Amino acid sequence: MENFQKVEKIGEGTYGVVYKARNKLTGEVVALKKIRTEGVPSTAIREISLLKELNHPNIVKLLDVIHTENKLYLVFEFLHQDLKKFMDASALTGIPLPLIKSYLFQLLQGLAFCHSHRVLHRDLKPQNLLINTEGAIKLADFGLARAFGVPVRTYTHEVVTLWYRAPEILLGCKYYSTAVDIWSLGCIFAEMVTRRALFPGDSEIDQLFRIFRTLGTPDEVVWPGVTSMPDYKPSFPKWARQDFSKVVPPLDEDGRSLLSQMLHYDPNKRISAKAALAHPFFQDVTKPVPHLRL
Ligand SMILES: NS(=O)(=O)c1ccc(/N=N/c2ccc(O)[nH]c2=O)cc1
């Protein structure tokens, strides 16, 4: 727009490209998501306008939605750093446990909110988690049931990511449950602790097999109905579940317990965001402030 001076290309955020921008009338600094024709989908505009009504301190605010120039512009609250950059910045030192715990707690509060309004994130990954200097972390760039795709990229371009995808999705499930977000958040939790991605797949089958190698090949005893899922194959290799103490060391037993419940195969056994908030891991949760180099 003329209304907005692009300051800096922030990223390429899962539907298009995101810029840091200043409103030349009001002066406010925002995130501007650009989505590039043929009168695009009224049904997206309603699940999008729905995203606008999400109101919670741990969810990045969608300020406005502007449809123009054969484009869709989403105007979002701006934060100065994402979790991926923060994790890279502290990869030698580690993120201190109280801060990891604070971040996990806030994100569970955010998901508990979304999920109680029947909204799923669908695309949770470090790059979609934004932090500020006050110790806050916020869910950003929510994905849509369809929107513009579901493409195999934000667009065009570059690096689509399977790393945080729940196994029921990889196994061809049609209807997502809130559980898929808990799985992604579990993967992110592991990654904050170990400073390495938990399941860094290079393809959809490699992603699935990396999960099987770690958590064991699922069967009817641990996940009733799995062998009838659309993409399940009897020919999957049978990997034994490897011991969980090897997964996220040196995380304490409270942390390992909670992670284990967030990574249950069966989406019905997987812990809910609200039940997670009650886990003994959060007995001593506080709100540290990060040291941010902006
Ligand atoms: N320099 S950095 O990589 O850590 C980084 C990354 C993203 C960023 N802002 N991104 C946003 C994305 C979506 C949104 O609704 N708001 C944002 O601020 C601001 C900074």
Rounded to whole angstroms, the Cα distance separating 4 from 185 reads: 34
Instruction: Please return the burial class of 24, using the count of CB atoms within 10 Å of its CB with bins 0-12, 13-18 and 19+.
Output: exposed
Rounded to whole angstroms, the Cα distance separating 170 from 50 reads: 27
Local structure of 211: helix, strand or coil: helix
Residues 71 and 150: beta-carbon distance below 8 Å: no
**DSSP at 284:** G
- Residue 129, C-beta contacts closer than 8 angstroms, at least 6 positions apart: 82, 83, 103, 107, 137, 138, 139, 140, 188
Residues 278 and 86: beta-carbon distance below 8 Å: no
Q: How many residues does the chain have?
A: 294
Q: What are phi and psi of 98, to 5 degrees?
A: -60, -30
Q: Which atom of ligand 1 is nearest to the CA of 85?
A: 4
Rounded to whole angstroms, the Cα distance separating 180 from 161 reads: 14
Centre of ligand 1 from the C-alpha of residue 101, in Å: 22
Centre of ligand 1 from the C-alpha of residue 174, in Å: 31
Residues with beta carbon inside 6 Å of ligand 1?
10-11, 13, 18, 31, 60, 76, 78-82, 85, 130, 140-141
Name residue, tokens 């105007």. Answer: 75
Domain 81-291, CATH homologous superfamily name and number? Transferase(Phosphotransferase) domain 1 (1.10.510.10)
Centre of ligand 1 from the C-alpha of residue 291, in Å: 17
Rounded to whole angstroms, the Cα distance separating 18 from 176 reads: 26
Q: Which of 43, 46, 21, 50 is nearest to 33 (CA)?
A: 21
Q: How many helices (H) and strands (E) does the chain have?
A: 8, 8
Domain with CATH 3.30.200.20 in the chain: 1-80
Q: Mutation test of ligand 1: which of 8, 54, 76, 82 has the most ligand atoms closer than 8 Å to its C-beta?
A: 82
Question: Any binding-site annotation on 174?
Answer: no
Rounded to whole angstroms, the Cα distance separating 127 from 82 reads: 6
Residues 204 and 214: beta-carbon distance below 8 Å: no
Ranges assigned E (strand) in 36-154: 62-68, 71-77, 81-82, 129-131, 137-139
Residues 212 and 206: beta-carbon distance below 8 Å: no
Rounded to whole angstroms, the Cα distance separating 86 from 195 reads: 11
Q: Which helix (H) or strand (E) holds 133?
A: none
Rounded to whole angstroms, the Cα distance separating 195 from 96 reads: 12
CATH assignment of 1-80, among 3.40.630.40, 3.40.50.300, 3.40.50.620, 3.30.200.20: 3.30.200.20
Domain with CATH 1.10.510.10 in the chain: 81-291
Rounded to whole angstroms, the Cα distance separating 266 from 225 reads: 9
Residue type, 229: M
Q: Which atom of ligand 1 is nearest to the CA of 60?
A: 15
The CB-side HSE value for 124 (13 A sphere, CA atoms) comes to 30
Rounded to whole angstroms, the Cα distance separating 32 from 3 reads: 11
Q: What are phi and psi of 216, to 5 degrees?
A: 95, 150
Rounded to whole angstroms, the Cα distance separating 240 from 141 reads: 36
